Each structure stands twice: as C-alpha cells, then as structure tokens.
User: Which sequence fits this backbone?
C-alpha cells in the first residue's frame, strides 16, 4: 500500500537552517514526482517546489532561490532544505506525490504533515 | 501572473449537488492548466480528488465527478453529509509553477 | 582444460537491470551443458538454432551469457521476431538467432516485503534497437510537440521505469531471471567443447 511519512521535532531558532525528511513506501521514486507545499496556521496552502522523477527541480517564483530539495532513490527518501528562515515561515509542511506519467496528472497522495515553527 | 480566487462559501443539503468555481488570472482556464481538487479533513488530513481536469484519484468514490463544465474550472458532488464536510482547494499548473487557491469551506445543511 | 564458469553466471548474487544487461564472454574451457539442462528449476528452457541434447558434442568459437531480470509476462518477447517494450527498446535478439534462452522464477530473491524497485527498464525510445544493442543513455524523452530541451516537464519523461515487485504479486508479475546463451558457431579455432 502506498504511504507517505515525514518526521521531525521541527522547532527552529531565527537565522539558522533546518531540514525535513519524507519517507515513502509502496511506490518508486523513478515512477513518480514529489512536490512540497507549506501551510501557515489558518491560511491557504502555497506550493514550494517539485523534484521530478530523475532529478531536476522547479521552485515557487518569488520564493527564495536559497532553498533546495533533494532525494535518494536507494532508501526511498526525500529531503527539503532551506538555508535561512524568517518568522512568517512557521507552518505545517506536507510531502506529496505527483503521478504525471499516467492517468492522474495531479498530486495523487498526501503526507501526514509536519509542524515547523521558528521561535 | 499568479492570482487564483475561489468563493470560499458553500452549503449543500443532503442529496443536492453544488458547483464551486475556481478561476485563474489568465482568463478562462486552459486545458494545459491541469485542474486539481484536494479534500481537507478537519484533523489536518489531505487527499487528492481530481487531476488532469477529469481524472479521479484511485480509490475515491465514483460519487465525485468534475470537469470544465463552465469556462472556469469547477467541481460537483451529490450530497452525502457524513463524509463530505471538508475544505477544498483548486490547483492550476502554470508552466512555471503550481498555484493553489484560497479554498472553499463546504458546510452541508 | 578447466571447467567453464557457468556457476558464476547462473548463481550470481545480484543480476543486472534490463536496459544495462551484462554480457559475460566465455572461452577456452570444457562446457558442461548436461548439468544445467538436468536441473529442474529452470521454468523455460528454449534452444532456437540447435537442439538441447546435441549441445554436449558441438564445439563453438565462443559464447556470450547475458543476464537480466524481467517480469514474468514479458518472457515471451525474448525470442527472435517478436515485439513489445523489451524487444523494441531494451534487448533485441537478431533474426536467425542461434542459442538457448533460460529463465526461472526468482520471487524469493528479487522481491521483498514493501516491494523491490531497483530493477529498471527503458520505456520511451526514439527508435528500436539493432540486435544486441545496449543503449544505456538516459536522454530526456519528448512525447510532446514542443522541444523538451532537457527540462523534465509534463511531457519530458525520464526514459527509465522501475519494476514493482511485491512479495505477493501474481505469477505474471513476479520477477523472472533470464540467461541467454548465444553460440556463434563459426569455423574459427574451436575453444569451447563438451566432453
Ligand atoms: C548453482 O547452485 C546450485 C544450487 O544447488 C548448484 O547445484 C549448482 O551446481 C550451481 N552451479 C550451476 C552452474 O548451476
């Protein structure tokens, strides 16, 4: 069964960098793509970026280019990294699967969500 | 060229169908901007309902069905009160990036 | 005259993927085809240019042993004159092929709980392969009219896909290892014979 896990205590201090990890079962990272979205408390969710099936990224336009997403096909893991945080970034972050090879061209399945709060 | 808007207010009594419209800032939404519908559980649980403007996700009931019925993207559902109390967000694929709407709060009866 | 290294070929720990199938040359040894045929594990043993019982006496120039892991349903495409994803884009056997195709189920090795996704095959290709071609390139495909130009858009697929081997998949979808022996039976100095 397809399943998404992402884990971390999260909490950050201003002006440092913390990273979150997404761990997957039931599907191969070569057959799908992974997209990340960010949910500040009580607002609408914004899309951060996507790591395509075999490397190569896209990012949200005005969102800082000083961030990167990366993955490991061997262990079936995905990592999001931001190198500097600002207090508006306190949010819940979600991993998501994009099935653009076959039928369902959108975000097929979604993770359980991780709280990331600075200060 | 990123603004996408939704009504964000809805109510359908059980058995009655409603349509919520999500519209872009490039005029009527193109087929290229693939439409997505996601469902929000009140316990911070998310799932994907519609992709590619017509495709249901695997394992979602056939009661859910949507298309470009109007010029702007929209979605419809027959009324099942217990499992349809949810928030719904529309997403459009601009070639550069995905944009998510504010989301519509469904309050059946 | 030492024995041929068939044990390495047939009892190797990890087999190669379909698109990067490994070729092992064999030469200058005494082949023992009886051993392999007599064993019962090999689900599909098919010799095309020769007969399996004759093999113990023929003398060849040299022989190539290929290996890869494919899905159970696609075993048929490993034969002269058929088509499919494997034949067209991965591993094409020339017409008038002369050798033996050996396959057996390996569900107890190549499939683990949670699925095994390390075996890859080429799915989108510009054109079919020439016989015994081994294109390992990962050039970004382009299924759309627009030029992809190396950016993996919604119509710029990566040309490799990984098999999904669940421990409880159907027999059709379980991984079968395949070994193809190709005897190029010229009249150059014979190097491999049977006792
Ligand atoms: C491979 O392993 C089997 C396991 O019993 C053994 O019988 C055989 O001699 C080995 N070598 C070959 C070439 O099959």
Assistant:
């Amino acid at each position: 069964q397809v399943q998404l896990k992402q884990s971390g205590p999260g909490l950050v201090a201003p002006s440092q960098s913390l990273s979150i990890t997404c761990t997957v079962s039931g599907f191969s990272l070569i057959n799908y793509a992974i997209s990340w979205v960010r949910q500040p408390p009580g607002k609408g969710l914004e899309w951060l970026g996507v790591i395509w099936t075999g490397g190569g990224t896209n990012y949200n336009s005005a969102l800082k280019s000083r961030l990167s997403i990366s993955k490991d096909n061997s262990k079936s893991q995905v990592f999001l990294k931001m190198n500097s945080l600002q207090t508006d970034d306190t949010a819940r972050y979600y991993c998501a699967r994009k099935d653009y090879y076959g039928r369902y061209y959108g975000m097929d399945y979604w993770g359980q969500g991780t709280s990331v709060t600075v200060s | 060229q990123a603004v996408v808007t939704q009504e964000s207010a809805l109510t359908t009594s059980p058995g009655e169908t409603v349509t919520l419209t999500c519209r872009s800032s490039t005029g009527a939404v193109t087929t290229s901007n693939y439409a997505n519908w996601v469902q929000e559980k009140p316990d911070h649980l998310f799932t994907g309902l519609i992709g590619g403007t017509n495709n249901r996700a695997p394992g979602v009931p056939a009661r859910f069905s949507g298309s470009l019925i109007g010029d702007k993207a929209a979605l419809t559902i027959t009324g099942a009160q217990t499992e349809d109390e949810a928030i719904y967000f529309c997403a459009l694929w601009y070639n550069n990036h995905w944009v998510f709407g504010g989301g519509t709060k469904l309050t059946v009866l | 005259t030492n024995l041929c290294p068939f044990g390495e070929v047939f009892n190797a720990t990890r087999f190669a993927s379909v698109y990067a199938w490994n070729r092992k040359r064999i030469s200058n040894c005494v082949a023992d085809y009886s051993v392999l045929y007599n064993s019962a594990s090999f689900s599909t043993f098919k010799c095309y240019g020769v007969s399996p019982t004759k093999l113990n006496d023929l003398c060849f120039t040299n022989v190539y042993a290929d290996s890869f892991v494919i899905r159970g349903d696609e075993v048929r495409q490993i034969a002269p004159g058929q088509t499919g994803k494997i034949a067209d884009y991965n591993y094409k056997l020339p017409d008038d092929f002369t050798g033996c195709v050996i396959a057996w189920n390996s569900n107890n090795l190549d499939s683990k709980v949670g699925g095994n996704y390390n075996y890859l095959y080429r799915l989108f290709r510009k054109s079919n392969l020439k016989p015994f071609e081994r294109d390992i390139s990962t050039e970004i495909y382009q299924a759309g009219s627009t030029p992809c130009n190396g950016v993996e858009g919604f119509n710029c697929y990566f040309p490799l896909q990984s098999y999904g081997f669940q421990p409880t998949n159907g027999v059709g979808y379980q991984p079968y290892r395949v070994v193809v022996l190709s005897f190029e039976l010229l009249h150059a100095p014979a190097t491999v014979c049977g006792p």
Q: What stands out?
A: Chain B touches chain C at residues 34, 93, 95 (CB under 8 Å). Chain B is about 0% helix and 40% strand.
